Design a protein around this ligand. Structure first.
Ligand SMILES: *C(=O)c1ccc(-c2ccc(C(=O)OCC)cn2)nc1
Ligand SMILES: *NNC(=O)c1ccc(-c2ccc(C(N)=O)cn2)nc1
Length: 9
């Protein structure tokens, strides 16, 4: 989950 969002960065 964290990674899925973190792609923005
Ligand atoms: C939430 O974005 C997210 C994405 C991907 C994963 C995840 C966990 C584990 C692996 C893996 O290769 O484990 C090997 C033991 C890959 N991707 N978790 C949470
Ligand atoms: N928000 N994330 C990025 O801007 C980003 C993170 C990681 C990477 C990237 C690209 C290529 C490799 C590799 N060849 O191992 C690893 N990580 N790009 C962009």
């Amino acid at each position: 989950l964290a990674a899925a969002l973190a792609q923005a960065l």
